[PDB]
Amino acid sequence: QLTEEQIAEFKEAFSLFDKDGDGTITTKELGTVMRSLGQNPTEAELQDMINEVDADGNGTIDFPEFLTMMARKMKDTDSEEEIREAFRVFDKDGNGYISAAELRHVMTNLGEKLTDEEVDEMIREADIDGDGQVNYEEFVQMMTAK
Amino acid sequence: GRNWKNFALVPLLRD
Ligand SMILES: [Ca+2]
Ligand SMILES: [Ca+2]
Ligand SMILES: [Ca+2]
Ligand SMILES: [Ca+2]
């Protein structure tokens, strides 16, 4: 029951990291993405991140190893502390609502080239109440519900 | 209608 939709989504996420498109994610590529989000992982942390999933021992992450990384993380995310941390990454002005403009800004900072329509689509997918924004409860639902 | 969950998880990868 893996869908074509889920695969395309994983593919988009992989390509966010794989900025040179060589089909592998290196420590440098992980470092660049986490730094674009205001984090500062050390070389050792980056190596440990790859090591957790590096099935062939080659020092980089390929597609199925990236899928493994994501699946582990989905399973590991129930804590309000982790989810609230992710929420604040997107709720730039801290007003408790992720707007289409805030999501556009974060996507741009990540290097993801998305149309205005694609960003509105993302807000619509997570918006439950229909106010046109994403509140914390809606963000939780998006993260824990699948 | 476009699921964004994988992006929202990225800040949590560091765990
Ligand atoms: Ca690469
Ligand atoms: Ca590998
Ligand atoms: Ca906001
Ligand atoms: Ca809403």
One domain, residues A74 and A135: no
- The HSE-up count of residue A55 (CA atoms within 13 Å, CB side) is 8
- Cβ–Cβ below 8 Å for B12 and A70: no
**Whole-angstrom Cα distance, residue A8 to residue A144?**
20
Neighbours of A113 (CB within 10 A): 8
One domain, residues A57 and A111: no
Q: What is the 3-state secondary structure (H, E, C) of chain A?
A: CCCHHHHHHHHHHHHHHCCCCCCCECHHHHHHHHHHCCCCCCHHHHHHHHHHHCCCCCCCECHHHHHHHHHHHHHHCCCHHHHHHHHHHHCCCCCCEECHHHHHHHHHHHCCCCCHHHHHHHHHHHCCCCCCCEEHHHHHHHHHCC
Q: How far is CA B7 from the centre of its chain?
A: 3
One domain, residues A49 and A105: no
**Whole-angstrom Cα distance, residue A73 to residue B11?**
11
Stated in angstroms to one decimal place, the resolution of this structure is 2.0
Domain end residue (candidates: A28, A47, A79): A79
Q: What angle do CA A95, A101, A106 make, to 5 degrees?
A: 90
One domain, residues A8 and A70: yes
Residue A58 labelled as part of a binding site: yes
For residue A101, the enclosing domain spans 80-144
Number of structural domains, chain A?
2
Domain end residue (candidates: A36, A60, A79): A79
State the structure-solving technique.
Answer: X-ray
Q: How far, in Å, from the CA of A135 to the mean position of ligand 3?
A: 9
Q: How far, in Å, from the CA of A36 to the mean position of ligand 1?
A: 17
**Whole-angstrom Cα distance, residue A106 to residue A81?**
20
Shortest distance between the Cα of A77 and any Cα of chain B, in A, equals 8
Q: Is the CB of residue A89 less than 8 Å away from at least one CB of chain B? A: yes
Residue A9 labelled as part of a binding site: no
One domain, residues A85 and A125: yes
Domain end residue (candidates: A79, A103, A122): A79
One domain, residues A96 and A37: no
One domain, residues A92 and A138: yes
One domain, residues A19 and A73: yes
Residue A78 labelled as part of a binding site: no
- Cβ–Cβ below 8 Å for B3 and A5: yes
Label the pairing between strands A97-98 and A134-135.
Answer: antiparallel
For residue B7, the SS3 value is helix
